[PDB]
Amino acid sequence: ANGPLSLLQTAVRSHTQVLISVRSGRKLLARVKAFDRHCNMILENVKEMWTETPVTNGKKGRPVNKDRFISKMFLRGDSVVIVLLS
RNA sequence: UUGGAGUAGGCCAGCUCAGACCGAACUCAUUUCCUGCCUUUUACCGGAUGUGACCGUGAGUUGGCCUGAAAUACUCCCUAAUCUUUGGAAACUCUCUGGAUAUCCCAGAUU
Numbered sequence: 001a002n003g004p005l006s007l008l009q010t011a012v013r014s015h016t017q018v019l020i021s022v023r024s025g026r027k028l029l030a031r032v033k034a035f036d037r038h039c040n041m042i043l044e045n046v047k048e049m050w051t052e053t054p055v056t057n058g059k060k061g062r063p064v065n066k067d068r069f070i071s072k073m074f075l076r077g078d079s080v081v082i083v084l085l086s
Numbered sequence: 087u088u089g090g091a092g093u094a095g096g097c098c099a100g101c102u103c104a105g106a107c108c109g110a111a112c113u114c115a116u117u118u119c120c121u122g123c124c125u126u127u128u129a130c131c132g133g134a135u136g137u138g139a140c141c142g143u144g145a146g147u148u149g150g151c152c153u154g155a156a157a158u159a160c161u162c163c164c165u166a167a168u169c170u171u172u173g174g175a176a177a178c179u180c181u182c183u184g185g186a187u188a189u190c191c192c193a194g195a196u197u
Contacts, residue, residue, distance in 0.1 A: 023175045038166050053178090058190040078172045 008035040011085055017045075019084045020075075026050040029086075030073060039080070043073035 001009075011018060011032035020028040020041075030046035049067035053060060 023173090025176050038172065040166095040172090051177090055191090076172075077166065079175090081175085 004039065005035075007085060008032065008039060011035075017086045019086050021081045022075075023079055023081055024050070036077075039077040041073075041075035041077075041080075043075060044071070046070040046073040 012034060015031055015033075017029060017031050020030070022028060027049050028043075028046065029049075030043040033042045033044060035041060047067060047069055049065050051063050052066045053063045055061065
């Protein structure tokens with residue numbers, strides 16, 4: 001209640017966005033609603049982007065910052081690399 | 087952790103089974119014989135042998151009665167510190183092998 005719990009609770013109270021890099025090499029921009037002792041995350045207005053290299057006709061193409069929008073999202077605590085309270 | 091199926095206790099009455107221990111208990115009668123006592127019978131003696139009755143018992147089941155209780159409850163069926171669900175991931179190159187075999191691709195294996 002004086003550390004990571006304080007950061008997650010402050011994010012919950014302020015309803016501010018976090019930028020999360022995750023173990024699938026992916027990047028997330030979403031708001032904070034709730035957290036637990038496992039630091040599992042429930043998310044809103046989620047913008048998910050990632051780097052994908054399309055294999056055009058057997059040749060390595062330039063990467064795409066492919067992104068999607070998810071309304072409501074739930075996240076697991078062990079899948080996190082880093083969270084930044086933006 | 088649940089949905090599905092359940093509903094009390096006491097008492098009374100009926101029905102069906104139960105002895106190899108229904109019964110940790112114990113009587114009576116009687117068939118066919120043997121013994122005894124006997125003038126005839128009944129009422130008897132006491133052994134065998136089967137056969138009935140009576141005083142009782144248990145389990146299941148069905149109906150009723152009495153007192154409750156009442157969306158309560160019980161009853162069944164069923165259900166993030168290493169070592170397992172709280173992660174070395176994710177991504178893909180290089181090399182090797184096979185198919186194709188001029189390559190791309192892909193599979194397997196390795197860093």
